[model samples]
Target: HWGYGKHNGPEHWHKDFPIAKGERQSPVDIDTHTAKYDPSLKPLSVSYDQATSLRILNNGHAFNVEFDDSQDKAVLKGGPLDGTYRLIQFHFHWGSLDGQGSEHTVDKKKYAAELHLVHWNTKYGDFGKAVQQPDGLAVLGIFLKVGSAKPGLQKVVDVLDSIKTKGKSADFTNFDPRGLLPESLDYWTYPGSLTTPPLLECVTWIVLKEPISVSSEQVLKFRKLNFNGEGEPEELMVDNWRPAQPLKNRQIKASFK
Candidate 1:
């Protein structure tokens, strides 16, 4: 029953999931002024198989693009990660409008949206088992701004009509998530948790500093989807993001100068 609505929103999540207020919770505002430049960090290696992409789903929270994690077909390694991390899924967090959508901000300035490429460490088994370990999950966060007409994103945009309602899903294959990456892979790394409910403190966040382009018109398409299920009261799925949490003295390392 957790949602972005007034009644069961982020503010009320601490009541059900006590860990929401725990140390290292995510979506922390990245203060570029204070982020330490770490010379020791390595360039992140990301590879994905188009065939590995399975389907897309409207999971009430956001429309998630899922992948086949049975093998190491699509995995993340290097750059603050120990070993291979299997690709699980990717989802978005956005605001009702254009100016303030992204969950993680840069210098308290929000972007139009945020994309999370979620991966789980194979050392911890699957996502279900990995969710319990502190270093089990690695979420690659990318900021999205309004600018160019990115054809790469149009693939998912076109499918929005089929799965407009909550709990709806459709086959979405042959899509490459690499097209989603920005020009630079330079990122900010820190220990954090899930931004939504059951905010497990298990994610090693690698948030890309550079953002990819999204047309102002394209972003409006995301707001058209419904957050509620069929026959339920209509609720626009805008502003599906949690605000930034306190840094709590955690060190945020920048991969670039």
Candidate 2:
């Protein structure tokens, strides 16, 4: 099975998914000085209804908080996007240590973790079909640093004990993620692909310039979760992030000056 272990990690993913080596691949090192500011870039309009969150599950990878996207109540638009994109689900990637976990780095600097709010273009109908089309997936990447505890993180962390192993599911709804976002939404936008496999090249990445804080203990909760099912030998989930890919012939546009 595809996983973050030795034989099935990111380095070996290219064998199964040739597009892994393709241009516009995601999680590139964000060189702040090189990011060109686009004066016409509009501010992001992100709206979320707490009731849209459905459940949380550990699917042998990262634990994701899935959502109910049947309606446009939870929507994201404006920043480097032509049409509206509906919020689907959100997940996180982290490392065994706080020093390195984020897939995308700022000026080659690593963060404690990265949070991806995945959305799909409504025109494409659903995530499955939208992933294959250009301009179908628009993901917002937020960096996490080790600092004071973020109250917004407690709700999720409090339930981590319930989903300690893979395939574990827990009711996690009525949570508005707007509180988890940074003070400023100024970001760097680029065309990229899913950091994980099938490695489809359809994402329009909007990475926040400002990072939110998460207590080191809060992150350790995620690290303590198992990568295997209940009966399988335990393997703690860690370093669940892809390294920064090359940004060949790509332009990273900034919404902030």
Candidate 3:
């Protein structure tokens, strides 16, 4: 059993979890300046069917939301993928209790946090099966910044009473993750690796160029997580982010106007 401590973060994590060394690790920069980017990947289409509902869980890191897609309520309107994929879970990565927890870095600058919207191919039945395929998943990464408070995030903050501490979770009902999406879906797309270990090379990352806003106080609360082992009181673990790596001959593409 490996623990997710401060000094014992991702760097030391790959030993226990070899996948961390995978070449496709995520949270990479998505430049908006590329000329050959795809235009067909913009303006996402989402469906809110009766079967489309929300589930909030404590994924051992941050509070994550999972959307039930089989139901008619949630439907995706557009984007690169068709109606064949199901919107599943979405979570976040934040800094310790100083607020610098973005998964990707660009020009040596990191954001306050990063949001990942995960969707799976419906053909695979569920996560267990779908995770096996290379094209079975598509994820969108939205960056967050500390600035004028964002009203959109209030929905998540309200649920803190239930999941106030680490490993603690509660069912957050009747909410849509779409509300948290940034105003623009125009993003830079690339074949990148997952940010976490077991760093699969299967993800198609869409990191938005624009960042969402959060208040300074709100960022402080995020830094309050404890990086120690389980059973210990959750304390501040604000600097939970990994630093940026070199381009190393890898090509990053985009899908924008």
Candidate 4:
């Protein structure tokens, strides 16, 4: 069981935590760019087949996509990121009952939500530990907007019925996620931390300013996950966001010209 209702909110994950220190978190502010940011730091791109398997882990707060690392699906073989960084797990970040979900901003305009595609450098040999290295990981930020139809996210939303309840997941396989990527691979890169707990200050961020749309129904399905399912009896948890942190003199780099 995912322990969503009984004492399973994100606030209490440290109790019997499966994730160790330096595990990347979500809901980061992506719009902040420093004056000195360079446009050359880009990540390597992998083909669709390179991503072999995909599994969804219901971790109370959200669904973490656990991939089959043994398969080439987990490795980054090309692009600016040329090393063997495996696709360990990816997750989603949304706002409270009625707020924005975009972890990053573009000129201060926030969106409905953001999806983070996380990959850790295999050189360190440990996913959790590698996240602590500034060059240890790559997170692709996809901004989501509210609209009548979502062309690219159809597959992801289709799985909502299987994992509708908290801590539950159905099989999600053979999905080519390249469609889910934004129009531009061109992005803004920077050094940042896991936006969630044990906030590790090491990440190469590639945030796309272009937003993809999701239908209202899809958004509703996303909100159905129980953050406090294991918590209070009468508690119907709505918001689960951490206020944006200070940029701390860090510069955000981009490949967009």
Candidate 5:
């Protein structure tokens, strides 16, 4: 049970999962000055069908909005990806406090929160099979800034009350993830791994340069969720993010010059 605690946190992950020390670890700091701008990068094309969204679950780590990936209902193409990537699920990572809990930082600056929309390549079969191969998964990272009220996000927030405990899930549909994304599709691309245990180096990271707005109060609800399951002592699910890993010989590409 790898957790974000003193005893079983990221620092101790390499003890069990040796690949945690791999070269292409995730949550790296994005230094804009040094990132190379590639004119060859194509504009990202994302299409999501509201019906593809199935339900929301409290996986103890974070609240995930799972999608029906049995078909190519929603997919992402272009922008550092070679093939179409089917959307599987989406989740968020936030801190207990305001203005400082995102996994990936820009110029060493931390944001209020971060969103990860997980997708897998159709060429690699299913998500389980795809996640183990290089270029098998693509995660779209969206930074969250606390300022304006995110009315589009209210739909997700409204369902939080029903799934306060870990392992609890509720029927969530008709919600399109595009409503929470920034207008600009410009992003930074890099090779990275999953931030959690079994940190596979299969993700083509597409992190948006622009941040979407989220109210201070909206972030508070995220911290209210518990990591412990029913009948167990409640553990505050805050700071569930891994620290930035060292970038070896990898180059980060920007979509816009």
Candidate 6:
């Protein structure tokens, strides 16, 4: 039940989830200039089946597009990952205003929002099981910029009106999540934890260098979603992002110079 409130914010998370203060935390500042270019890093291989997109739900925290990971229906390989990682769900963290919501920052610059595509390593089995082990999860971070309207994102935004309340859900299928990615696969990679609570240190983060465009109008729609469930006083679900953590001696690897 921890939230972004004063009493239970990221600053206070360590009191409950001690790992919040652990080394190798997520959403760290990606210093592009300092990032090492490893020519050995292979191009990221992403293959997602649009039809396997099952449902979309407002899980009281954020909106998530869940996929059918029963098998290797949608998989991510290469780019810091040793084996195949299966796509399970994707969600976003945003702010009430522009230019301040992304969990991770680049050279001290924050974006309008951040999209996280969550995946689990097949070597450890299911997501729930994988999360408990080291090197079990891989999350892709895609930054969102405010500018021209993104036609590809309209489909996801169109359904937002229906799931405005917490815990609300709708049948969201046949949607290709790849349409949301930037053109370049160039990225920064590091070992970090999930941005949310129970901040397990088990993720191989792949953050895109380029940003996807979204309109101001669409950004406002994201703020309209309620954090509280139906019948409770409405609280806008904005600023749902954790601040960037310290680097603490971890090296950021880049796929390109």
Clashes of each: 0, 0, 36, 19, 0, 0
Which sections of candidate 4 miss by over 4 Å?
A: 1-46, 77-82, 97-99, 230-238
Q: Per-residue lDDT of 65-96 in model 5, one digit per residue for the tens?
A: 99999988889989988989999999999887
- Residue-by-residue lDDT tens digits, candidate 6, 1-257: 77776777788889889999889998899999999999999899888753288889998889999999989888999988999999999999999899699999999999999999999999888999999978999999999999998887888999998999889999998888878888898989999999999899999999999999999998899999988899999989999899999989799999997
lDDT of each: 0.92, 0.92, 0.64, 0.62, 0.91, 0.91
Cα error, residue 73 of model 4, in Å, equals 2.1
Q: In model 2, which residue pairs have backbone atoms overlapping below 3 Å? A: none
Stronger candidate by lDDT (3 vs 5): 5
TM-score, each model? Answer: 0.98, 0.98, 0.83, 0.78, 0.98, 0.98
Residue pairs with colliding backbones in model 1 are none
Model with the higher lDDT, candidate 2 or 4:
2
The runs of at least 3 residues in candidate 6 whose Cα sits more than 4 Å from the true structure, single-residue gaps closed, are none
Q: List CA RMSD, all candidates.
A: 0.9, 0.9, 3.0, 4.7, 1.0, 1.0
Error of 1 at 134 (Å): 0.2
- The true-versus-predicted C-alpha distance at residue 205 of model 5, in Å, is 0.2
Model 1: per-residue Cα lDDT at residue 51: 29
Please give, for residues 1-257, the per-residue lDDT of candidate 1 as tens digits: 89998999999999999998898999999999899999999899887753278899999999999999988888898999899899999999988888988999999999999999999999987999998999989999999999997788999999998999899999999889988988899999999999998899999999999999999877889999999888999998999999999989698999999
Report lDDT (Cα) of residue 234, candidate 3: 58
Q: Give lDDT: candidate 1, residue 85.
A: 93
**Candidate 1 runs further than 4 Å off:** 49-51
Runs in model 5 lying further than 4 Å from the true structure? 49-51
Candidate 4 residue lDDT tens string, 1-257: 22223355444544554342333443345564433345555444755555644677565667776777654565553444647677776677776532476667666666777788777887887777786686787777787787756765677777765664456776777756676666566667666666665556566666775777777777777776665433434322234444344555655555554
